[PDB]
Amino acid sequence: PHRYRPGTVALREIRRYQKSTELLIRKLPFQRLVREIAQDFKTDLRFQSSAVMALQEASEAYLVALFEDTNLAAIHAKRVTIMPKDIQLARRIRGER
Amino acid sequence: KPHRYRPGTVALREIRRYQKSTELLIRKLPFQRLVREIAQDFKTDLRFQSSAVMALQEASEAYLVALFEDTNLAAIHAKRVTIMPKDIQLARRIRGER
Amino acid sequence: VLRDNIQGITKPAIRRLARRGGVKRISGLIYEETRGVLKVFLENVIRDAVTYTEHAKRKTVTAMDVVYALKRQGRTLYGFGG
Amino acid sequence: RDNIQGITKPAIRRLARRGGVKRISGLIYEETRGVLKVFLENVIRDAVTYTEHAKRKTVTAMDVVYALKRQGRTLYGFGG
Amino acid sequence: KAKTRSSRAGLQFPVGRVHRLLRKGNYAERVGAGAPVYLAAVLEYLTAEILELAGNAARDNKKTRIIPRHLQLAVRNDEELNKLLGRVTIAQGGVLPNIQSVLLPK
Amino acid sequence: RAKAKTRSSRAGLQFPVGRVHRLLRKGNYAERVGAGAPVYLAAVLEYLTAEILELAGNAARDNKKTRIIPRHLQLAVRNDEELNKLLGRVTIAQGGVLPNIQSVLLPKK
Amino acid sequence: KTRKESYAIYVYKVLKQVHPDTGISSKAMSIMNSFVNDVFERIAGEASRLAHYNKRSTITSREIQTAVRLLLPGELAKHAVSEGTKAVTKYTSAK
Amino acid sequence: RRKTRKESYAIYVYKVLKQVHPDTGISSKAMSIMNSFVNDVFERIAGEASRLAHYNKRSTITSREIQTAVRLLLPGELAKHAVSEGTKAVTKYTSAK
DNA sequence: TAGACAGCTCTAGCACCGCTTAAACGCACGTACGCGCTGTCCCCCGCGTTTTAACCGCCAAGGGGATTACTCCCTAGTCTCCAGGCACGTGTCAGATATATACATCGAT
DNA sequence: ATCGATGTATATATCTGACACGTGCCTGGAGACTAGGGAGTAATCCCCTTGGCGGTTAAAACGCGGGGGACAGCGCGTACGTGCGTTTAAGCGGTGCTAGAGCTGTCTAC
């Protein structure tokens, strides 16, 4: 049947998630992730939902900043596929690695 | 034939001395002139303490040496050795300076 | 004790965050690399928020703890208190 | 004027070698002169603003330290 | 007859609340009279600029109600507000619709 | 009247507790400052000073100098990972940089 | 007390002054308080350190004038200086 | 006229240096750098404690606010050792007059 | 006098079930893209020569930064009051959802 | 080209819940008088920043060979993109509960 070319629906996803607003991470696994992270520092924590969505928004924004820096450095590396070393270089340049 | 080192040995060796050394690598009179020329655009008849221009020189040198380190890191990341200004632009863009 | 929710951050979520991040094509170890970076960022922010909760002698992490945790690192987040 | 070109090409090479750069292109000197120029514009503008708040005709190292740590990079041993 | 300080300053933001926040914010032991007027003016101007560009983005998005997507568009489109808010995350704002030119098809 | 004994000597500290308390009070940090806050803060400052001074003395032994120079201070800051993280945005005046050459610039055989 | 401190009415009437046909969303509204609040502590803290460095004990229009010229970008700082001096002049003329 | 007094942490830093290294000296620029470091770390911790007291509507900065500031700003091992040192100093000062 | 404590309220966070379903997952399949390889050629390094100005020292001066003294006026301090500002109440309207329809863009031909 | 799929933009109707408006309230702001000290101004001084000259030597600039590295071209293969079937749990809704955030009162250490 009909099959799309490699990269064009990736660009469609880029457009459709850049025009969107909503969160790209499933809320229940991320909340469970926050609980299993925070259980280390103290046991028997409670979390307001507003705290959960705040943590999720901060995580998603920091991640997409990492992806845009990674894509910039990978295109700088004359590539379109991003390498993990691109992420490592981006975090080293940003001052957090 | 005169003794001539290969391209890259002298570069590595003076990398080594100026990684050991701590002195400023800019002549202080041209940098003084550049600082006062830049400060002319904000206020006329400005004076400068020697310690102030010293602090500007050392801070600028440290900032640009960190920029050079990130520039070489991004150049080697592109499977290269020579740095082009696109490397500097990428470093300042990832660092949020552009 | 909640365990192994890092795999709850699934492959479609990471590729969506890449698409919003402008990434066109993604390698394989990128997923676990971003998972480890998410570990680092979440441990730091959540540790600061837990410390903020500890000073207030509370047992519930408030969103104001989260914004003050984000504020100390300079990655301020808007819409949950000033 | 010519004072930005007073930051000599050997000085830029020396500073790149302190930064661990093996090989330098010819446009790097002008690019680094521009980067040093704009960084100096920002820091000197902030320091002159601090000076003009203090009603002084001279720029002190204290104002330099205040402007630098406003910019996010703080310097030790010159006040503060 | 009590008449407010905001009208006397010709401003909209509360001069009295700003002075109260200054005096309890522990910034100095004394606060001048015209200083909170200046604070209110600066805050009102920044608010007016961001609301104007948010309304422009809402009209571009054919909306008569400002949503955070218009706020992210207004912050990241204007260069001065983007430089002032470079270390700033807006929740439910998304990102700018930017695509790198290499990733475009040939 | 009893003998005047300093707060720092009572707290077993060399950093001046009274001077720290004075700087806290006129630093406009709070309208009240507790008794344990300047003692605690002077102890933390003395601990950090002791760590950095000990590492700088170790660097001075490594450089065979009996006087600690800013190069020793820079080496002591950057070699320790936690002190480097504490002073990441800190520039140290003429302490230079770490001697580091990445591997791909090294010559091959 | 149950009552809260917010700049909701002020930002809403500034919106009505600028565009008197546009509504505002509640999440966006809290974002407006977020804006106003943290630029309040950055400008106020800048005024605090500015008063501290010159050994001053009061915050006047000069300290925040310098603070605005520092923190704000050039056209924003210039406009803020001009209209803040205008508001101060209008306040002092009306006393 | 006579020059006014200019405060420094020089003698206390020298005492701590002799405590950690009885034979190692110090240079003037180095004591200036350590003086700046002490002043900046004092400013950071005191400002963090001031903001912490503002967050929890407390008007008195005590050892708890400074301890939470240590727990926040310093890294984990540095913060842990500083909490231990400050705790022992506070307890032995409380035992004293 | 504030904050540590006690005590009371009652909010909300957690926990759970169950159905739904869209999201995630497993997997086939081919090709585009990473990467290796090769050639090229240029252009940067290395070094000698020439140039130049950076540097140090030494002096002169003046101006402005710090200091001192005086004052007044501006800001805290206090109080009464009253109107701005702020939960609650309300309702209606902007936006979401759904449907039809035009319209450009991709892709096989 | 070119048509055909194919998603998007556009136009219209139903709905709803979110906000735009109203009410009451109260407390926060404003008005009035008070002290006082802080900041402003004038006088003072000196230093240190500025300016100049000299020389002189180190560095900067310049020429040039050349090599080696930047980069274009090509091959390749494989890993990632794209599609399909399955299923998994994210999600929504309702129910249960209670830990605990929140508030008030007391007072005494501070």
Coordinates of all heavy atoms in Angstrom, one line a residue, chain J residues 2-21:
Chain J
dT2 P -0.6 17.4 -16.4 OP1 -1.1 18.0 -17.6 OP2 -0.9 18.0 -15.1 O5' -1.0 15.9 -16.4 C5' -0.2 14.9 -15.7 C4' -1.0 14.2 -14.6 O4' -0.1 13.7 -13.6 C3' -2.0 15.1 -13.9 O3' -3.1 14.3 -13.4 C2' -1.2 15.5 -12.7 C1' -0.4 14.2 -12.4 N1 0.8 14.4 -11.6 C2 1.6 13.3 -11.2 O2 1.3 12.2 -11.5 N3 2.7 13.6 -10.4 C4 3.1 14.9 -10.0 O4 4.2 15.0 -9.4 C5 2.3 16.0 -10.5 C7 2.7 17.4 -10.1 C6 1.2 15.7 -11.2
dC3 P -4.6 14.8 -13.6 OP1 -4.9 14.9 -15.0 OP2 -4.7 16.0 -12.7 O5' -5.4 13.6 -13.0 C5' -5.0 12.3 -13.2 C4' -4.7 11.5 -11.9 O4' -3.5 12.0 -11.4 C3' -5.8 11.7 -10.8 O3' -6.1 10.5 -10.2 C2' -5.1 12.7 -9.9 C1' -3.7 12.2 -10.0 N1 -2.7 13.2 -9.5 C2 -1.5 12.8 -8.9 O2 -1.3 11.6 -8.8 N3 -0.6 13.7 -8.4 C4 -0.9 15.0 -8.6 N4 0.0 15.9 -8.1 C5 -2.1 15.5 -9.2 C6 -2.9 14.6 -9.6
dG4 P -7.5 10.2 -9.5 OP1 -8.4 9.7 -10.6 OP2 -7.8 11.3 -8.7 O5' -7.2 9.0 -8.6 C5' -5.9 8.5 -8.4 C4' -5.5 8.6 -6.9 O4' -4.5 9.6 -6.7 C3' -6.6 8.8 -5.9 O3' -6.4 8.0 -4.8 C2' -6.4 10.3 -5.6 C1' -4.9 10.4 -5.6 N9 -4.4 11.7 -5.7 C8 -5.0 12.8 -6.4 N7 -4.3 13.9 -6.3 C5 -3.2 13.6 -5.6 C6 -2.1 14.3 -5.2 O6 -1.8 15.5 -5.4 N1 -1.2 13.6 -4.4 C2 -1.3 12.3 -4.1 N2 -0.3 11.8 -3.3 N3 -2.3 11.5 -4.5 C4 -3.2 12.2 -5.2
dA5 P -7.6 7.7 -3.8 OP1 -8.1 6.3 -4.1 OP2 -8.6 8.8 -3.9 O5' -7.0 7.7 -2.4 C5' -5.8 7.0 -2.1 C4' -4.8 7.8 -1.4 O4' -4.5 9.0 -2.0 C3' -5.2 8.1 0.1 O3' -4.1 7.9 0.9 C2' -5.5 9.6 0.0 C1' -4.5 10.1 -1.1 N9 -4.9 11.3 -1.7 C8 -6.0 11.6 -2.4 N7 -6.0 12.8 -2.9 C5 -4.9 13.4 -2.5 C6 -4.3 14.7 -2.6 N6 -4.9 15.7 -3.3 N1 -3.1 14.9 -2.1 C2 -2.5 14.0 -1.4 N3 -2.9 12.7 -1.1 C4 -4.1 12.5 -1.7
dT6 P -4.3 7.7 2.5 OP1 -3.9 6.3 2.9 OP2 -5.6 8.2 2.9 O5' -3.2 8.7 3.2 C5' -2.8 9.9 2.4 C4' -2.9 11.1 3.2 O4' -3.4 12.2 2.3 C3' -4.0 11.1 4.3 O3' -3.5 11.7 5.5 C2' -5.2 11.9 3.7 C1' -4.4 12.9 2.9 N1 -5.3 13.6 1.8 C2 -4.9 14.8 1.4 O2 -3.9 15.4 1.7 N3 -5.7 15.3 0.4 C4 -6.8 14.7 -0.1 O4 -7.5 15.3 -1.0 C5 -7.2 13.4 0.4 C7 -8.4 12.7 -0.1 C6 -6.4 12.9 1.4
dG7 P -4.0 11.2 6.9 OP1 -3.1 10.0 7.3 OP2 -5.5 11.0 6.9 O5' -3.6 12.4 7.9 C5' -2.4 13.0 7.8 C4' -2.5 14.5 7.4 O4' -3.3 14.7 6.2 C3' -3.3 15.3 8.5 O3' -2.4 16.3 9.1 C2' -4.4 16.0 7.8 C1' -4.0 15.9 6.3 N9 -5.1 15.8 5.4 C8 -6.1 14.9 5.3 N7 -7.0 15.1 4.4 C5 -6.6 16.3 3.8 C6 -7.2 17.0 2.8 O6 -8.2 16.8 2.1 N1 -6.5 18.2 2.5 C2 -5.3 18.6 3.2 N2 -4.8 19.8 2.8 N3 -4.8 17.9 4.2 C4 -5.5 16.8 4.4
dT8 P -2.8 17.3 10.3 OP1 -1.7 17.6 11.1 OP2 -4.1 16.7 10.9 O5' -3.3 18.6 9.5 C5' -2.3 19.2 8.6 C4' -3.0 20.4 7.9 O4' -4.0 19.9 7.0 C3' -3.7 21.4 8.8 O3' -3.3 22.7 8.4 C2' -5.1 21.1 8.6 C1' -5.2 20.7 7.1 N1 -6.3 19.8 6.8 C2 -7.0 20.0 5.7 O2 -6.7 20.9 4.9 N3 -8.1 19.2 5.4 C4 -8.5 18.1 6.3 O4 -9.4 17.4 6.0 C5 -7.7 18.0 7.5 C7 -8.1 16.9 8.4 C6 -6.7 18.8 7.7
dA9 P -3.5 24.0 9.4 OP1 -2.2 24.7 9.4 OP2 -4.1 23.5 10.6 O5' -4.5 24.9 8.6 C5' -4.3 25.4 7.3 C4' -5.6 25.8 6.6 O4' -6.5 24.7 6.5 C3' -6.4 26.9 7.4 O3' -6.9 27.9 6.4 C2' -7.5 26.1 8.0 C1' -7.7 25.0 7.0 N9 -8.3 23.8 7.7 C8 -7.9 23.2 8.8 N7 -8.6 22.2 9.2 C5 -9.4 22.0 8.1 C6 -10.4 21.0 7.9 N6 -10.7 20.0 8.7 N1 -11.2 21.2 6.7 C2 -10.9 22.2 5.9 N3 -10.0 23.2 6.0 C4 -9.3 23.0 7.2
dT10 P -7.6 29.2 6.9 OP1 -7.3 30.3 6.0 OP2 -7.2 29.4 8.4 O5' -9.1 28.9 6.8 C5' -9.7 28.6 5.6 C4' -11.2 28.3 5.7 O4' -11.4 26.9 6.1 C3' -11.9 29.2 6.7 O3' -13.1 29.7 6.2 C2' -12.2 28.2 7.9 C1' -12.4 26.9 7.1 N1 -12.3 25.7 7.9 C2 -13.0 24.6 7.6 O2 -13.7 24.5 6.6 N3 -12.8 23.5 8.4 C4 -12.1 23.4 9.5 O4 -12.0 22.4 10.2 C5 -11.4 24.7 9.9 C7 -10.5 24.7 11.1 C6 -11.5 25.7 9.1
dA11 P -13.8 31.0 6.7 OP1 -13.4 32.1 5.9 OP2 -13.6 31.1 8.2 O5' -15.4 30.7 6.5 C5' -15.8 29.7 5.6 C4' -16.9 28.8 6.3 O4' -16.3 27.7 6.9 C3' -17.7 29.5 7.3 O3' -19.1 29.6 6.9 C2' -17.5 28.7 8.6 C1' -17.0 27.4 8.0 N9 -16.2 26.6 9.0 C8 -15.1 27.0 9.5 N7 -14.5 26.1 10.3 C5 -15.5 25.0 10.3 C6 -15.5 23.8 10.9 N6 -14.6 23.4 11.8 N1 -16.6 23.0 10.7 C2 -17.5 23.4 9.8 N3 -17.6 24.6 9.2 C4 -16.5 25.3 9.5
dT12 P -20.1 30.4 7.8 OP1 -21.1 31.0 6.8 OP2 -19.4 31.4 8.7 O5' -20.9 29.3 8.7 C5' -21.7 28.3 8.1 C4' -22.1 27.3 9.1 O4' -21.0 26.6 9.6 C3' -22.9 27.8 10.3 O3' -24.2 27.2 10.4 C2' -22.0 27.4 11.5 C1' -21.2 26.3 10.9 N1 -19.9 26.0 11.6 C2 -19.7 24.8 12.2 O2 -20.5 23.8 12.1 N3 -18.5 24.7 12.8 C4 -17.5 25.6 12.9 O4 -16.4 25.4 13.5 C5 -17.8 26.9 12.3 C7 -16.9 28.0 12.4 C6 -19.0 27.0 11.7
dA13 P -25.3 27.8 11.4 OP1 -26.6 27.8 10.7 OP2 -24.8 29.0 12.0 O5' -25.3 26.7 12.6 C5' -25.8 25.4 12.3 C4' -25.6 24.4 13.4 O4' -24.1 24.2 13.6 C3' -26.1 24.8 14.8 O3' -26.9 23.8 15.4 C2' -24.9 25.1 15.6 C1' -23.8 24.2 15.0 N9 -22.5 24.6 15.2 C8 -21.9 25.8 14.7 N7 -20.6 25.9 15.0 C5 -20.4 24.8 15.8 C6 -19.2 24.4 16.4 N6 -18.1 25.0 16.4 N1 -19.3 23.2 17.2 C2 -20.5 22.6 17.2 N3 -21.6 22.9 16.6 C4 -21.5 24.0 15.9
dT14 P -27.7 24.0 16.7 OP1 -29.0 23.3 16.5 OP2 -27.8 25.5 17.0 O5' -26.9 23.3 17.8 C5' -26.7 21.9 17.8 C4' -25.9 21.4 19.0 O4' -24.5 21.9 18.9 C3' -26.4 21.8 20.3 O3' -26.5 20.7 21.2 C2' -25.4 22.9 20.8 C1' -24.1 22.4 20.1 N1 -23.1 23.5 19.9 C2 -21.8 23.3 20.2 O2 -21.4 22.2 20.7 N3 -21.0 24.3 20.0 C4 -21.3 25.5 19.4 O4 -20.5 26.4 19.2 C5 -22.7 25.7 19.1 C7 -23.2 27.0 18.5 C6 -23.6 24.7 19.3
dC15 P -27.1 20.9 22.7 OP1 -27.7 19.6 23.1 OP2 -27.9 22.2 22.7 O5' -25.8 21.2 23.6 C5' -24.7 20.2 23.5 C4' -23.5 20.8 24.2 O4' -23.0 21.9 23.4 C3' -23.7 21.3 25.6 O3' -22.6 20.8 26.5 C2' -23.6 22.8 25.5 C1' -22.6 22.9 24.3 N1 -22.6 24.2 23.6 C2 -21.4 24.8 23.3 O2 -20.3 24.3 23.5 N3 -21.5 26.0 22.6 C4 -22.6 26.6 22.4 N4 -22.6 27.8 21.8 C5 -23.9 26.0 22.8 C6 -23.8 24.8 23.4
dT16 P -22.9 20.5 28.0 OP1 -23.5 19.2 28.2 OP2 -23.5 21.7 28.6 O5' -21.4 20.4 28.6 C5' -20.3 20.9 27.9 C4' -19.5 21.9 28.8 O4' -19.5 23.2 28.2 C3' -20.1 22.1 30.2 O3' -19.0 22.4 31.1 C2' -21.0 23.3 29.9 C1' -20.1 24.1 29.0 N1 -20.8 25.2 28.2 C2 -20.1 25.9 27.3 O2 -18.9 25.8 27.2 N3 -20.8 26.8 26.6 C4 -22.2 27.0 26.7 O4 -22.7 27.9 26.0 C5 -22.9 26.2 27.6 C7 -24.4 26.3 27.8 C6 -22.2 25.3 28.3
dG17 P -18.4 21.3 32.0 OP1 -18.4 20.0 31.2 OP2 -18.9 21.4 33.3 O5' -16.8 21.7 32.1 C5' -16.2 22.4 31.0 C4' -15.9 23.9 31.3 O4' -17.0 24.7 30.9 C3' -15.8 24.2 32.8 O3' -14.7 25.1 33.0 C2' -17.1 24.8 33.2 C1' -17.4 25.6 31.9 N9 -18.8 26.0 31.8 C8 -19.9 25.5 32.4 N7 -21.0 26.0 32.1 C5 -20.6 27.0 31.2 C6 -21.4 28.0 30.5 O6 -22.6 28.1 30.5 N1 -20.6 28.8 29.6 C2 -19.2 28.7 29.5 N2 -18.6 29.5 28.7 N3 -18.5 27.8 30.2 C4 -19.2 27.0 31.0
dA18 P -13.2 24.7 33.4 OP1 -12.9 23.4 32.7 OP2 -13.1 24.7 34.9 O5' -12.3 25.8 32.8 C5' -12.6 26.3 31.5 C4' -13.0 27.8 31.5 O4' -14.4 27.9 31.7 C3' -12.3 28.6 32.6 O3' -11.8 29.8 32.1 C2' -13.4 28.9 33.6 C1' -14.6 29.0 32.6 N9 -15.9 28.8 33.3 C8 -16.2 27.9 34.3 N7 -17.4 27.9 34.7 C5 -18.0 28.9 33.8 C6 -19.3 29.4 33.8 N6 -20.3 29.0 34.5 N1 -19.6 30.4 32.8 C2 -18.5 30.8 32.1 N3 -17.3 30.4 32.0 C4 -17.1 29.4 33.0
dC19 P -10.6 30.6 32.8 OP1 -9.4 30.4 31.9 OP2 -10.5 30.1 34.2 O5' -11.0 32.1 32.7 C5' -11.5 32.7 31.5 C4' -12.7 33.6 31.7 O4' -13.8 32.9 32.3 C3' -12.4 34.8 32.7 O3' -13.1 35.9 32.2 C2' -13.1 34.3 34.0 C1' -14.3 33.6 33.4 N1 -15.0 32.7 34.3 C2 -16.4 32.6 34.2 O2 -17.0 33.3 33.4 N3 -17.1 31.8 35.1 C4 -16.4 31.1 36.0 N4 -17.0 30.3 36.8 C5 -14.9 31.1 36.1 C6 -14.3 32.0 35.2
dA20 P -12.3 36.9 31.2 OP1 -12.3 36.3 29.8 OP2 -11.1 37.4 31.8 O5' -13.3 38.2 31.0 C5' -14.6 38.0 30.4 C4' -15.7 38.5 31.3 O4' -16.0 37.6 32.3 C3' -15.4 39.8 32.0 O3' -16.4 40.8 31.7 C2' -15.5 39.5 33.5 C1' -16.4 38.2 33.5 N9 -16.2 37.4 34.6 C8 -15.0 36.9 35.1 N7 -15.1 36.2 36.2 C5 -16.5 36.1 36.4 C6 -17.3 35.5 37.4 N6 -16.7 34.7 38.4 N1 -18.6 35.6 37.3 C2 -19.1 36.4 36.4 N3 -18.5 37.0 35.4 C4 -17.1 36.9 35.5
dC21 P -16.4 42.3 32.3 OP1 -17.0 43.2 31.3 OP2 -15.0 42.6 32.9 O5' -17.4 42.1 33.6 C5' -18.8 41.8 33.3 C4' -19.5 41.6 34.6 O4' -19.0 40.5 35.3 C3' -19.6 42.7 35.6 O3' -20.9 43.2 35.7 C2' -19.0 42.2 36.9 C1' -19.2 40.7 36.7 N1 -18.3 39.8 37.5 C2 -18.8 39.0 38.5 O2 -20.0 39.0 38.7 N3 -17.9 38.3 39.2 C4 -16.6 38.3 39.0 N4 -15.8 37.6 39.7 C5 -16.0 39.2 38.0 C6 -16.9 39.9 37.2

